[PDB]
Design an enzyme around this catalytic site. Sequence first.
Site, PDB file in Angstrom:
ATOM      1  N   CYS A 141     -15.001-111.006   6.037  1.00  0.00           N
ATOM      2  CA  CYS A 141     -15.032-109.710   6.688  1.00  0.00           C
ATOM      3  C   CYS A 141     -14.372-108.683   5.782  1.00  0.00           C
ATOM      4  O   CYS A 141     -13.440-108.997   5.040  1.00  0.00           O
ATOM      5  CB  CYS A 141     -14.332-109.786   8.059  1.00  0.00           C
ATOM      6  SG  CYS A 141     -13.821-108.233   8.782  1.00  0.00           S
TER       7      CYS A 141
ATOM      8  N   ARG B 149     -45.549 -88.177  -2.365  1.00  0.00           N
ATOM      9  CA  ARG B 149     -44.499 -87.523  -1.596  1.00  0.00           C
ATOM     10  C   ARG B 149     -44.607 -86.006  -1.716  1.00  0.00           C
ATOM     11  O   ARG B 149     -45.703 -85.469  -1.877  1.00  0.00           O
ATOM     12  CB  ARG B 149     -43.122 -88.003  -2.056  1.00  0.00           C
ATOM     13  CG  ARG B 149     -42.893 -89.490  -1.827  1.00  0.00           C
ATOM     14  CD  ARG B 149     -41.450 -89.886  -2.081  1.00  0.00           C
ATOM     15  NE  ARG B 149     -41.215 -91.297  -1.801  1.00  0.00           N
ATOM     16  CZ  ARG B 149     -41.315 -92.266  -2.701  1.00  0.00           C
ATOM     17  NH1 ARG B 149     -41.651 -92.014  -3.955  1.00  0.00           N
ATOM     18  NH2 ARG B 149     -41.068 -93.521  -2.335  1.00  0.00           N
TER      19      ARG B 149
END
Lengths: 464, 464, 464, 108
Positions: free
Chosen positions: A314, A396
Site C-alpha cells: 500500500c 483529432r
Amino acid sequence: VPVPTGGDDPTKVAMLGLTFDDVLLLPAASDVVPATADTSSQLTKRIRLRVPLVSSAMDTVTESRMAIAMARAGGMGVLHRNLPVAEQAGQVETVKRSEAGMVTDPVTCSPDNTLAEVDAMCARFRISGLPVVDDTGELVGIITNRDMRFEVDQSKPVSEVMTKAPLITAKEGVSAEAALGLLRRHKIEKLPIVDGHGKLTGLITVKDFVKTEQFPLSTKDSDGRLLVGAAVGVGDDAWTRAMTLVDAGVDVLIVDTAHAHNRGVLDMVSRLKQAVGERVDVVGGNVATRAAAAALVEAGADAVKVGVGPGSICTTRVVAGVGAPQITAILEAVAACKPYGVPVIADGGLQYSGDIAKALAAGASTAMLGSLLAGTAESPGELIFVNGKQFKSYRRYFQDDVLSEDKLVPEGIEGRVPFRGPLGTVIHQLTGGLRAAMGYTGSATIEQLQQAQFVQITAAGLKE
Amino acid sequence: VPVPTGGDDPTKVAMLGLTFDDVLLLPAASDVVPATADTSSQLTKRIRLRVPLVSSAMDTVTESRMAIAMARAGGMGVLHRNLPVAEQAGQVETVKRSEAGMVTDPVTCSPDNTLAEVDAMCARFRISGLPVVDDTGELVGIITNRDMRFEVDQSKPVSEVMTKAPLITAKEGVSAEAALGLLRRHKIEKLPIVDGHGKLTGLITVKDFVKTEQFPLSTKDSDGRLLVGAAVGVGDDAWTRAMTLVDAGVDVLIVDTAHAHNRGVLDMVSRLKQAVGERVDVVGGNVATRAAAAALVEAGADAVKVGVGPGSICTTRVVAGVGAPQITAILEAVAACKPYGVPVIADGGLQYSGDIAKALAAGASTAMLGSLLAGTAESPGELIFVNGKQFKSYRRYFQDDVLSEDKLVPEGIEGRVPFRGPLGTVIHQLTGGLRAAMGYTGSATIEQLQQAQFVQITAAGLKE
Amino acid sequence: VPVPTGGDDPTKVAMLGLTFDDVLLLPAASDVVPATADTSSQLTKRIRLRVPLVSSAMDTVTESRMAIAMARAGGMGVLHRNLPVAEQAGQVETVKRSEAGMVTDPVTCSPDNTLAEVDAMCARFRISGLPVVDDTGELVGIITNRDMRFEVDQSKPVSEVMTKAPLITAKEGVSAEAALGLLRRHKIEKLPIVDGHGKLTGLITVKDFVKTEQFPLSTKDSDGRLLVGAAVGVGDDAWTRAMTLVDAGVDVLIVDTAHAHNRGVLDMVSRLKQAVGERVDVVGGNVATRAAAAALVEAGADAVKVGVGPGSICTTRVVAGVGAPQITAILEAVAACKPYGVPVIADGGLQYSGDIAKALAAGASTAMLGSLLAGTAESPGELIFVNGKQFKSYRRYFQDDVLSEDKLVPEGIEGRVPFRGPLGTVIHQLTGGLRAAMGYTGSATIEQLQQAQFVQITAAGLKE
Amino acid sequence: AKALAAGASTAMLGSLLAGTAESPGELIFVNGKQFKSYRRYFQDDVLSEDKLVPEGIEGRVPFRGPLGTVIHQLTGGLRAAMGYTGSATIEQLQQAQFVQITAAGLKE
Ligand SMILES: Nc1nc2c(ncn2[C@@H]2O[C@H](COP(=O)(O)OP(=O)(O)O)[C@@H](OP(=O)(O)OP(=O)(O)O)[C@H]2O)c(=O)[nH]1
Ligand SMILES: Nc1nc2c(ncn2[C@@H]2O[C@H](COP(=O)(O)OP(=O)(O)O)[C@@H](OP(=O)(O)OP(=O)(O)O)[C@H]2O)c(=O)[nH]1
Ligand SMILES: Nc1nc2c(ncn2[C@@H]2O[C@H](COP(=O)(O)OP(=O)(O)O)[C@@H](OP(=O)(O)OP(=O)(O)O)[C@H]2O)c(=O)[nH]1
Ligand SMILES: Nc1ncnc2c1ncn2[C@@H]1O[C@H](COP(=O)(O)OP(=O)(O)OP(=O)(O)O)[C@@H](O)[C@H]1O
Ligand SMILES: Nc1ncnc2c1ncn2[C@@H]1O[C@H](COP(=O)(O)OP(=O)(O)OP(=O)(O)O)[C@@H](O)[C@H]1O
Ligand SMILES: Nc1ncnc2c1ncn2[C@@H]1O[C@H](COP(=O)(O)OP(=O)(O)OP(=O)(O)O)[C@@H](O)[C@H]1O
Ligand SMILES: [Mg+2]
Ligand SMILES: [Mg+2]
Ligand SMILES: [Mg+2]
Ligand SMILES: [Mg+2]
Ligand SMILES: [Mg+2]
Ligand SMILES: [Mg+2]
C-alpha cells in the site's frame, strides 16, 4: 524487565495485527442451508440492507448508474465527490427518480418544448414519456416515445406530437393492483395520477412493476424510491455540498477522510448531525483504532468506517509507514462501537468472498467494495475493443491525416482496465460465497455470523 | 485485559492451527527395523487393515477395480456415489465376488445361455468359466474359456460347447489342502462343490490360491471375500441407496458430507446404526473440531473422518473463508474420539508419505488417499498416448470427413491427467516411508506411533 | 511459365525488400581519420547542414527548445503541427530570435511596461534585458535583469528601474570585433545599435559571442539566425498555417503526410513552390517507391522524405498490411531523385548509429530521428522523480484531503517515459558512430559515403 | 487485405469470431473476467466445493463482445489498405503489388 522485542516500554509495540490471510472461519453446529440464509444487515442505525455490500465512492467505481445497480442488487452505492457540487446533486436526483420516483413529483414538459429536450430528459431518467403541463398548470396530454419514434424533425414542438386529453388517469392514493388493472385493461404503459381538480400529481409507469418483479431485493426509502449515499469532505465547500445533496434528496452522508481521528472531521460530523440528523444518516470517515471509533461514536456518527491502509503493498505503508491490519482494526472498532449499537463498515483489503465473510465475522456489519467493481458495465468509463478483448478506458483536432497510424488504433488504448461485465453476476458470486460461509458456521443471520470464531494459521498454510 | 490480536473476547481467535508443513517427527529410542515394523491399524472398531490406507471415494479414484486393488494391497476402497443406485450396488457385487466369492453362492449359467452372455459374465467377474445349471436345478456340466476359445459363432448355446457331467467335484467343507490336491491330481483349474444330494453349492478356482500366494495382505470378511466400503448421502434417496448397498453385501457405509456437524447427518448415522448396525460399520462425514467429533461419537459412528478444507489454497478457504489446518483438527478429533475407542480417518491435505506418518502420529488411525491415486491404472479413466507420453482422460456421428484434423489427433486430448502406473508401486512407496518413520521413532506398531512427539519448525525451515 | 512464388504474373511480387538488419557496410581503401571526416550534407537544394540529422516533427520530440538545440548541434529541427497556428508561429518566432536575432529587429519595451511583462519577454526569448523605446520612438534607456534582480514589487514600471539614456551604443554595420571591444572596454554585456539619427535599429549581446564560441557548428540563415522548419498538412487550414509560418520567418516547410503519392499533396507542394518558393524550401511527404519520388520531384519538391511503414513491428504493417523495407525504399527513391539533384531524407526505422551510416550509404542525404530524441531534456514533457529514477511525463481541484494517497505520489507517473539527459551527448554519440563508418569505408565526405557498397547477410548473421 | 490483393474475392473468418457474443456457447464469470464455455444429478451436497465454482470453468475461451465491433475493426483495416494502395474497389485491390520481406523484417 526488558521487553523481548526491545526497549523498556511494554506498550511501544501496542499489538499484533492480523490480516484476512491470517485467520479462517471454524465450522460449527449448523442447521442452515445456504439457500435459506438471511444476509440482511444494518448499514446505519436506521437503514437495513438485504445484501451487506456498498460501493466504494471512487471516481472509477460509483456514479448514478452504479448507485442504481447496487440499490437494485440489494445493497447501496455512495457517489464520489471528485466533481462539482451541481453534478453530484444531479446524480443524486437521477438515482432518486430512476424507479418509482415520479409518483409524487413527476417530471413534466411544456407544449412549447422541442422533441430534442424531451428526448434528453427521457434518456437521463430512463423513462419513455412525460406528461405535458401548460403555463396554466393543466394536464393537456402525454408524449411517449411511440409518438416520436419516426419523427425526423427533432425541432418540432411537443404540441404537434403529443396525445391530447382526455387521458386514462387514476385518483390519488391508487393501489398498485388497481393501477396494474387499468394498465392491462387500456393496454397502455403509463398512468397519470391527478387530484380532485384534475391537476397532475404523479405518474405510474409499467417500469415500476417490471423492476419490482425483476429486483425483489431493492433498497428503498419510505416513499419507495431507491436509496443512495454521497461523500463530502471537511470545510465550507463541504458544508455547501452537503446542504445541496440533502436538498437533492440523499439518504446517507459519508464524511470521507483518510484519517478521521481529527478535530475537524469530528466537528463536521457533529454539525451535520445537528443540522440534518433528523433526515439523513451520517457516517464517519476511516478509523483504524478503538479510540478513534469511540471518538466518532461520541461525535454522533450513525456508522463507522474502518480501513486505514489495509492493503499489504500500500502507498500509505511504503511512503508513510502508517497502516493497520484489517482484522485487528475491525475487532478494535467493534469493541468500541457495539455497546452503542453503531454499525461498522469494513473498507479496503477485500479480494474474495471469503474475505467478506471474515470481515463480517470479525464484527463488521457491511463491507465496501472497491477494485472488485471497477471494471463492471455499470461503473464509469467507456468500453473499447483491443486485441480481441474488451477493456474499459477513462479517456483529432489538428491531426487531419486520413492515413495516419493514430486512425488505425482505438482511442484510450493507453490506461485501460479489463472489462468485468454486469454487476449482478459479481454480486451474486459474492453473496453465494457469503451464504456458503453462513452454512458452514451455522449462522442463520449476519448477527449470528458476527459471533463466529476464528482459527489463526501459520505461514505454512499460505503456501501454494 | 485487551487481547493482543484485537478486541476483548479471548476466545474470538480460538486456537493456532498447525498443518503438515509446520511439524516434524522427533527421533526416539528405537529397536525397530523398518522391514519388520507392523503397520496394521483399525479402520473401524471391528475392521483392522494390514496397511492403514483407504481410497478417497471420488469419481476419479475409486470404482470396483480400485476397490479390488486396494483390498489386495492391504487397505480398502470406498466406492463413490456419483452414479445410480443400481450401478453402485453392481460395483459392490463385482468387488465381493472377485476373489474366493463363489465358495458359497457361485455364479451359474444355463444350457440355454449363449456364449456371448457367458463371456460377458466372465469378463465382469474375471473368472474363466461357470458351472451350468438347468431349469430343474442339477449340475449338468461346466463351461470354461478353453472350451469356447475358438468358437467363431458366439450365438452358440452353452449345451453345444460345455463339458458334460460327471465332473470332478468335492464335498462341502473341503479344506484348501484337499482342493489343491484334487486340482493337482486331475490337472484342472476348477472344482465344483456339491452337497450330499449332488446339488451345486459352490465353486473353487485356482485363482483363489494364486491370489492368496500373490497378495498375502488381502483384507477379507468372515467369509473370505474382499472388503469394500461405499458412500451415501443424506435423505430418502440416501436411505434407499444404503439399503440396496447393504443387500449387495457392503461392509462399510460412509456418510460422506462436507460438513457433518449437522442434525440431518447425525440422524442418518443413528438410523443406519439402528437398522443395519449389527452387520455394517457406519463412518461419519468430515468434522474439523472436537465438538463435532463428540457429536458423531454420541450418534453412534464407528469411525470419524476429519478433513474440512485442509488444503492451503482451497476452494473452501478462498470462496467461503472456512477451513482448519489438518494437524490441529486431527489432534482435537482424537481428543474427542479416543476415550471411546473410535478410530480417526485423516482425509485431505496429504502430499507425501511423511504427511501420512505425521497424520498417524497426530492420533489418526487411518489415512484416506485422494489425488495421489487419481492417475493410476486401476483408477477410472481411459489411457491415451499424446506427444510421446501416457495420459488418463475422462472423455464421429456427423464428422464423416476422413481427412479432417479431428481424425489426426486422439480423442480426449483436452482435460487429460498424467498416468501413474500400477497402484501397488505407489502403495509400496508410501508404506516404505511409513516404515522408515516408524523405525526412526521407535514404534513397533501404529498404536505406539500415535504416541510420538512433534517439533514445531519456523518459516526458515521451509525455505528451499 | 509459372512464377516460382505463385501465379502467372512476374510483377505481382515486385521486389525483395531489404531492411537495415539485412546489410552491412564493406570496408574499402581508406586514408580517412574518423576525427577529420567531413559530415556536412545537403538538407535541401539550398540548405547544407554540418551534421546530417533532423528532428522528427512529433509532438513528443520537437518544439522551440528542441529546435534551438538541434540547430546549435549542427542539424535542424522541424516543428510539429499538432497545435494551433498561432502557437506554431510563436515557436518559429522564438527560434528565430534566440541567438543573434535582435541585430535588425530587436524586441523592445515601453517605459509604462511593468517589470512582470519584461520578465516574461526575457524568459521567452532567453535574454537578460531589453532596450526601452517611448511612444515617440526614441531610445530612452535599457533595462536588464541586474537592474530588477531584487525588485520585490513586480508591478513597478520600467521607467523607475531602467538605466536612463545616454547609453553606450554603436553605429550600424559595426563589426563583431568592434562590438566585442566596446563590450570589453565598458565592461557591459549589451550594446544597442543606432543609425545616424540616433534611432534604435538593433542590439548585440554577449550571448552572441558566447554561443558562437560554444557551438561552432550552428546552422544559420543569411541573416545569421538559427534555421528552423515547420510541418503543414493539406487543405485550406493548411494554406493559412503555411502563410502564417512563412510570415513568422520559417526556412523550411514540410508537407507532412503519411502517403504523399496523392494528387492533393502534389498540388499543395506545387502551390507552395509557386507562392513562397523564392524564400522557403518545400519538402514533400513520405514516399516509398520510385514513381512517388518522381512525382514529388516533378511537383517541384526541394527534398523528398521516404519512410512508409519502415518498422518491422509496425501499426501500418499489422492493421493495413502496407509497408516497405527502408533500404530498398531509399535505393528506389534515390534512383528517382538523384538525376535532378533532389536530396533524400531517411525517416523511420533508425535504432543505432550503424543504421544512420547504412541509410546515408544507401543514397540518403539526411536522416530524421524520432524516438531516439524523445526522452532528452530539450524534448517536450516534464521531468519527474519516481522510485529512484528520472522519467519524463506528458501530463487537486476537488481532492482537498491532505492525507490522501494521491498526495503521496508524484503526478504524471502514468504514461511516463525514461529520461535521456542532454541532446548534445546523443548527437555526439551518433556522429562518432557515423565518423567511424566513414573511416572504415574510406569516405572523406558524405557524398563519398553515398557510393559505398553493401554485403547482404543471412539469418544466421543475426543470431545472438 | 493481403488475401484480397492476392486475388481472392472473399475471406472466411474462424477463430477471430469464436468468442463473440453471437457465437455459440454460454457466458460465464470466472476470477473477475468473462469467458465463453461449451458445457448436479447425484451431487446433492449443498456445501460441496462443486457448488462454490461455476460449471464449465474448464475448457473455456475468452469473451470477445459484440460481433459488429470486430467486423468494424477489420473493415477499417481493409479501408486503410485500400486508401494506401489507391484502390477504389476490391477489383482494383486485386491488382495491387507485393514486396517480399526477409527474416530480419519479422524481428521485433
Ligand atoms: N426516450 C428514451 N427512452 C429510453 C431511453 N433509455 C431507456 N428508455 C426507456 O426507459 C424505460 C426503462 O428503461 P430500461 O432500460 O428498462 O431500464 P434502466 O432504468 O435500467 O435503464 C423503457 O421504456 P418503457 O416503456 O418503460 O419499457 P418497455 O416498453 O421498453 O418495456 C425504455 O424504452 C432513452 O435513451 N430514450
Ligand atoms: N473369459 C474371460 N476370462 C477372463 C477375462 N479376463 C480375465 N479372465 C480370466 O480370469 C481369471 C483371473 O483373472 P486375472 O487377470 O488373473 O485377475 P484379476 O481378478 O486381477 O483381473 C483368469 O483365468 P484363470 O483360469 O483363473 O487363470 P490362468 O489360467 O490364466 O492362470 C483369466 O483368464 C475375460 O475378459 N474373459
Ligand atoms: N530575465 C531572465 N533572463 C533569463 C532567463 N533565462 C535565461 N535568461 C538569460 O538569458 C541569457 C542566455 O540564456 P542561457 O541560459 O545562457 O541560454 P539558452 O538560450 O540556451 O537558454 C542569460 O543572460 P546573459 O547576460 O546573456 O548571460 P550571463 O551573464 O548569465 O552569462 C540568462 O541570464 C529568465 O527566465 N529570465
Ligand atoms: N394514460 C394514457 N392515456 C392515453 N393514452 C396514453 C396513455 N399513456 C400512453 N398513451 C398513448 O398510447 C400510445 C402508446 O402508449 P405507451 O406508453 O404504452 O407506449 P410506449 O411506451 O411509447 O411504447 P413502446 O415501448 O412500444 O415504444 C402512445 O400514443 C401514447 O401517447
Ligand atoms: N472340475 C472339472 N471336471 C471336469 N472337467 C473340468 C473341470 N474343470 C474344468 N474342466 C474342463 O477341463 C478343460 C480345461 O479345464 P481348465 O479349467 O483347467 O481350463 P481353462 O481355465 O479354460 O484353461 P486356460 O486358462 O489355459 O484357458 C475344459 O474343457 C474344462 O471344461
Ligand atoms: N549599453 C549600455 N549602456 C549603459 N548601461 C548599460 C548598457 N548595457 C547594460 N547597462 C547597464 O549596466 C548594468 C549591467 O549591465 P549588464 O548587461 O552587463 O548586466 P546583466 O546582464 O543584467 O548582468 P548579470 O548577467 O550579472 O545579471 C545594468 O544596470 C544595465 O542597465
Ligand atoms: Mg415503452
Ligand atoms: Mg413497451
Ligand atoms: Mg484358466
Ligand atoms: Mg490356466
Ligand atoms: Mg548577463
Ligand atoms: Mg553576466
